[PDB]
Structures are given as C-alpha cells and as structure tokens.
PDB file of C-alpha atoms in Angstrom:
ATOM      1  CA  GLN W   1      18.879   2.210 100.756  1.00  0.00           C
ATOM      2  CA  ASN W   2      16.955   3.412  97.710  1.00  0.00           C
ATOM      3  CA  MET W   3      19.971   2.653  95.528  1.00  0.00           C
ATOM      4  CA  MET W   4      19.859  -0.948  96.723  1.00  0.00           C
ATOM      5  CA  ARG W   5      16.122  -0.828  96.056  1.00  0.00           C
ATOM      6  CA  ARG W   6      17.075  -0.048  92.463  1.00  0.00           C
ATOM      7  CA  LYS W   7      20.068  -2.374  92.093  1.00  0.00           C
ATOM      8  CA  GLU W   8      18.099  -5.418  93.212  1.00  0.00           C
ATOM      9  CA  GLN W   9      14.978  -4.349  91.324  1.00  0.00           C
ATOM     10  CA  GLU W  10      16.967  -3.979  88.109  1.00  0.00           C
ATOM     11  CA  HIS W  11      18.655  -7.331  88.601  1.00  0.00           C
ATOM     12  CA  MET W  12      15.478  -9.165  89.573  1.00  0.00           C
ATOM     13  CA  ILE W  13      13.757  -7.738  86.502  1.00  0.00           C
ATOM     14  CA  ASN W  14      16.266  -9.307  84.106  1.00  0.00           C
ATOM     15  CA  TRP W  15      16.697 -12.631  85.910  1.00  0.00           C
ATOM     16  CA  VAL W  16      12.985 -13.392  85.637  1.00  0.00           C
ATOM     17  CA  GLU W  17      13.109 -12.656  81.914  1.00  0.00           C
ATOM     18  CA  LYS W  18      16.227 -14.715  81.223  1.00  0.00           C
ATOM     19  CA  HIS W  19      14.544 -17.407  83.349  1.00  0.00           C
ATOM     20  CA  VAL W  20      11.273 -17.879  81.463  1.00  0.00           C
ATOM     21  CA  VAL W  21      13.138 -18.458  78.188  1.00  0.00           C
ATOM     22  CA  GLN W  22      13.613 -22.148  78.966  1.00  0.00           C
ATOM     23  CA  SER W  23       9.849 -22.544  79.459  1.00  0.00           C
ATOM     24  CA  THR W  24       3.129 -26.905  74.313  1.00  0.00           C
ATOM     25  CA  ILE W  25       1.216 -26.335  71.067  1.00  0.00           C
ATOM     26  CA  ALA W  26      -1.602 -24.678  73.027  1.00  0.00           C
ATOM     27  CA  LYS W  27      -0.130 -21.293  72.101  1.00  0.00           C
ATOM     28  CA  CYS W  28      -0.226 -21.949  68.353  1.00  0.00           C
ATOM     29  CA  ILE W  29      -3.829 -23.165  68.476  1.00  0.00           C
ATOM     30  CA  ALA W  30      -4.572 -20.024  70.480  1.00  0.00           C
ATOM     31  CA  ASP W  31      -2.949 -17.933  67.747  1.00  0.00           C
ATOM     32  CA  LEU W  32      -5.235 -19.377  65.075  1.00  0.00           C
ATOM     33  CA  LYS W  33      -8.074 -18.695  67.511  1.00  0.00           C
ATOM     34  CA  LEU W  34      -6.740 -15.166  67.937  1.00  0.00           C
ATOM     35  CA  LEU W  35      -6.522 -15.058  64.147  1.00  0.00           C
ATOM     36  CA  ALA W  36     -10.012 -16.560  63.946  1.00  0.00           C
ATOM     37  CA  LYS W  37     -11.277 -13.574  65.959  1.00  0.00           C
ATOM     38  CA  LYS W  38      -9.385 -11.151  63.708  1.00  0.00           C
ATOM     39  CA  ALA W  39     -12.337 -10.338  61.420  1.00  0.00           C
TER      40      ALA W  39
ATOM     41  CA  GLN U   1      -1.659 -15.965  77.768  1.00  0.00           C
ATOM     42  CA  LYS U   2       1.904 -17.131  78.346  1.00  0.00           C
ATOM     43  CA  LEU U   3       2.859 -13.536  79.123  1.00  0.00           C
ATOM     44  CA  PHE U   4       0.505 -13.404  82.098  1.00  0.00           C
ATOM     45  CA  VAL U   5       1.455 -16.790  83.545  1.00  0.00           C
ATOM     46  CA  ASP U   6       5.095 -15.810  83.094  1.00  0.00           C
ATOM     47  CA  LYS U   7       4.489 -12.587  85.020  1.00  0.00           C
ATOM     48  CA  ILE U   8       2.609 -14.259  87.870  1.00  0.00           C
ATOM     49  CA  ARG U   9       5.045 -17.161  88.181  1.00  0.00           C
ATOM     50  CA  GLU U  10       8.095 -14.913  88.180  1.00  0.00           C
ATOM     51  CA  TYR U  11       6.411 -12.685  90.754  1.00  0.00           C
ATOM     52  CA  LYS U  12       5.808 -15.721  92.950  1.00  0.00           C
ATOM     53  CA  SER U  13       9.420 -16.802  92.382  1.00  0.00           C
ATOM     54  CA  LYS U  14      10.939 -13.413  93.201  1.00  0.00           C
ATOM     55  CA  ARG U  15       8.749 -12.981  96.279  1.00  0.00           C
ATOM     56  CA  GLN U  16      10.339 -16.319  97.182  1.00  0.00           C
ATOM     57  CA  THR U  17      13.462 -14.598  98.437  1.00  0.00           C
ATOM     58  CA  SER U  18      13.306 -15.041 102.212  1.00  0.00           C
ATOM     59  CA  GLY U  19      15.703 -17.892 101.504  1.00  0.00           C
ATOM     60  CA  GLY U  20      17.678 -15.847  99.003  1.00  0.00           C
ATOM     61  CA  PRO U  21      19.213 -12.714 100.529  1.00  0.00           C
ATOM     62  CA  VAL U  22      19.845 -11.655  96.919  1.00  0.00           C
ATOM     63  CA  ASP U  23      17.630 -14.234  95.123  1.00  0.00           C
ATOM     64  CA  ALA U  24      20.453 -16.027  93.312  1.00  0.00           C
ATOM     65  CA  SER U  25      22.121 -13.066  91.649  1.00  0.00           C
ATOM     66  CA  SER U  26      25.400 -15.047  91.688  1.00  0.00           C
ATOM     67  CA  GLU U  27      27.142 -11.921  90.342  1.00  0.00           C
ATOM     68  CA  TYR U  28      26.989  -8.087  90.208  1.00  0.00           C
ATOM     69  CA  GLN U  29      28.951  -7.784  93.462  1.00  0.00           C
ATOM     70  CA  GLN U  30      32.083  -6.690  91.581  1.00  0.00           C
ATOM     71  CA  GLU U  31      30.154  -3.591  90.463  1.00  0.00           C
ATOM     72  CA  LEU U  32      27.949  -3.016  93.510  1.00  0.00           C
ATOM     73  CA  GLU U  33      31.105  -2.734  95.606  1.00  0.00           C
ATOM     74  CA  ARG U  34      32.414   0.126  93.472  1.00  0.00           C
ATOM     75  CA  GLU U  35      29.022   1.823  93.224  1.00  0.00           C
ATOM     76  CA  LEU U  36      28.520   1.919  96.982  1.00  0.00           C
ATOM     77  CA  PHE U  37      32.177   2.825  97.542  1.00  0.00           C
ATOM     78  CA  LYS U  38      31.844   5.849  95.274  1.00  0.00           C
ATOM     79  CA  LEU U  39      28.510   6.797  96.852  1.00  0.00           C
ATOM     80  CA  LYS U  40      30.173   6.757 100.265  1.00  0.00           C
ATOM     81  CA  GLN U  41      33.356   8.581  99.251  1.00  0.00           C
ATOM     82  CA  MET U  42      31.236  11.338  97.716  1.00  0.00           C
ATOM     83  CA  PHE U  43      28.894  11.545 100.708  1.00  0.00           C
ATOM     84  CA  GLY U  44      31.908  11.579 103.025  1.00  0.00           C
ATOM     85  CA  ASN U  45      34.549   9.370 104.583  1.00  0.00           C
ATOM     86  CA  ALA U  46      33.547   8.980 108.252  1.00  0.00           C
ATOM     87  CA  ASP U  47      31.403   6.233 109.804  1.00  0.00           C
ATOM     88  CA  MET U  48      28.152   7.568 108.409  1.00  0.00           C
ATOM     89  CA  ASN U  49      26.227   4.943 110.390  1.00  0.00           C
ATOM     90  CA  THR U  50      27.033   6.596 113.738  1.00  0.00           C
ATOM     91  CA  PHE U  51      25.979   9.862 115.311  1.00  0.00           C
ATOM     92  CA  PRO U  52      28.083  12.834 114.175  1.00  0.00           C
ATOM     93  CA  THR U  53      30.535  14.546 116.496  1.00  0.00           C
ATOM     94  CA  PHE U  54      31.128  18.291 116.429  1.00  0.00           C
ATOM     95  CA  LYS U  55      34.090  20.499 117.200  1.00  0.00           C
ATOM     96  CA  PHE U  56      33.246  24.177 117.641  1.00  0.00           C
ATOM     97  CA  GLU U  57      35.836  26.782 116.712  1.00  0.00           C
ATOM     98  CA  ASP U  58      35.695  30.390 117.887  1.00  0.00           C
ATOM     99  CA  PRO U  59      36.531  33.669 116.146  1.00  0.00           C
ATOM    100  CA  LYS U  60      39.742  35.666 116.294  1.00  0.00           C
ATOM    101  CA  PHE U  61      40.042  39.148 117.750  1.00  0.00           C
ATOM    102  CA  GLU U  62      42.464  42.001 118.321  1.00  0.00           C
ATOM    103  CA  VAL U  63      43.325  45.068 120.360  1.00  0.00           C
ATOM    104  CA  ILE U  64      40.584  47.663 119.950  1.00  0.00           C
ATOM    105  CA  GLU U  65      41.654  50.478 122.255  1.00  0.00           C
ATOM    106  CA  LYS U  66      44.115  53.175 121.271  1.00  0.00           C
ATOM    107  CA  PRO U  67      47.649  51.669 121.260  1.00  0.00           C
TER     108      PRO U  67
END
C-alpha cells in the first residue's frame, strides 16, 4: 500500500512538471520590476 | 509568480483523479508489475490477502526406561 503511495506520488510529481512546460510577456515585465526592486 | 500558479493548477489537476484511476500515467505498468511481483515473492508465495492457515507439528520421543 505504501509502495503504491510512493509509485503514484513519484509519477504524479513528474507528470505535472512535464505538463506545465507547454504553458505572456507579463513575466518579463515582472523581472524588470523584480530587478527594479534589486537596489 | 508562474511557479505558484503552476503549483496550484497542477495540484487541482492531480486532485482531479476520481476519473483517472491512475491520472493518465499511460505507462509504468511494465515496471510496476515486476516491482510488486518481487515484493510478493520476497514476502511469500501464498494468497497473502486471506487469513493464514496453520499446521502444528509435534515433537519426537523415545524409550526412556531401562531396555
């Protein structure tokens, strides 16, 4: 039971990461803002 | 914070698994079979989902008096 708890947890942890990769300039403007607050 | 929206959206997607008994793994069975097979065959070989049966042996003995 706990092994399945691991096997599905380890698979679900990679799927979600290989899933977001396909997912807007709002991030770049935020980086300059983050750089603006660099001081 | 694309990291945080990623985390929350993937959490909401994974918790969406009542429809997916494995949530679209689409693989890893070819290895899970062997893993669980080895786990079984090292734990035992009987039907480990049922209640165990028990045979009870008894010791040996001998003549004790003067022959």
